[PDB]
Every structure is written in C-alpha cells, then in structure tokens.
Amino acid sequence: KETAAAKFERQHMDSSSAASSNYCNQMMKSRNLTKDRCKPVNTFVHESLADVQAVCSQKNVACKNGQTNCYQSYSTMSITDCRETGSSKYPNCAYKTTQANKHIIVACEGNPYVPVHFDASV
Ligand SMILES: O[C@H]1CO[C@H]2OCC[C@H]21
Ligand SMILES: O[C@H]1CO[C@H]2OCC[C@H]21
C-alpha cells in the first residue's frame, strides 16, 4: 500500500488552522484511523507540509523507543490532540478534541529524509 512517508501525512497532516469540538470525530474517521479499531490517541499538525518536513533538519533528540532519529521543532506548531473517550466503543469511536501550540517531535528516515512517525509534542 502507501509508504511510511505517505502514512505520516495521512495520519498527522492537516494544513487545511486551529481546528471544532467535533473535529477529531470527523478527522479520525475520514483519515481511516478507526478502521480496525479506535486508535486511542492521535495528533494532527496544522502547519504546511514544508514546515513539518523541515523538522528533519532541526533539533536532534532521542526517540521514545531509544532510536536516535528523532527531531524536535525549533518553534511551536499549531496541533490538535485527539483522545478517545470512555463512552467510545468501536465502531462508534468518540474523541475529545484539544487544540494547542507546542513543539513537535518526529522520527525521520529515507532519501529524501522525511517524517515517518509522530513521536510526541512538548
Ligand atoms: O459533539 C458535539 C460538539 O459539537 C457538535 O457539532 C457536531 C457534533 C457535536
Ligand atoms: O462500556 C460502557 C461504558 O460506558 C458506556 O457508554 C458507551 C459504552 C459503554
């Protein structure tokens, strides 16, 4: 199917600015993140693809799994955190939409060196 780079864009990119309270419910579904199960948590970045791709040349930091290919953005970015509620039960996945402005940390790989995993937001 899709590549790791493409999967990252599908799961985490939404350049279309600060996200409603129904945002995650619609987005998690439209991006096919509720196909096999209700993905517990997810984060969407409201910045241009170029700006997110540029993070691969920014601050090198350790990944949560111990690998060394993670990078933290020098500036904060507009992001939306999606967290599954308790009343949420597949195939009816319910999410809590939370907007914020924080630095993002992504793992990069390949040639071209691009984001392939969203590690965290700090
Ligand atoms: O869960 C509530 C929050 O905002 C409403 O609009 C659509 C669905 C909704
Ligand atoms: O499993 C139970 C716990 O809370 C309910 O609401 C939706 C599904 C439910």
Domains, the chain: 1-122 (3.10.130.10)
Quote the CA–CA distance of 115 and 3 in Å, as a whole number. Answer: 11
41 is in an annotated binding site: yes
Q: For residue 57, give the nearest of 97, 115, 10 by alpha carbon.
A: 115
Q: For residue 49, give the nearest of 108, 3, 9, 102 by alpha carbon.
A: 9
39 is in an annotated binding site: yes
C-beta of residue 100 within 8 angstroms of C-beta of residue 81: yes
First to last CA, the chain: 31
Quote the CA–CA distance of 87 and 12 in Å, as a whole number. Answer: 24
Annotation marks residue 117 as catalytic: yes
Q: Residues for the chain: how many in total?
A: 122
C-beta of residue 52 within 8 angstroms of C-beta of residue 13: yes
Omega before residue 91 within 30° of 0, cis: yes
| CA 119–ligand 1 middle distance (angstroms) | 29
Q: Going edge to edge, which strands form the sheet with 70-72?
A: 59-61, 70-72, 104-109, 114-121
Q: What residue has token string 């990944």? A: 63
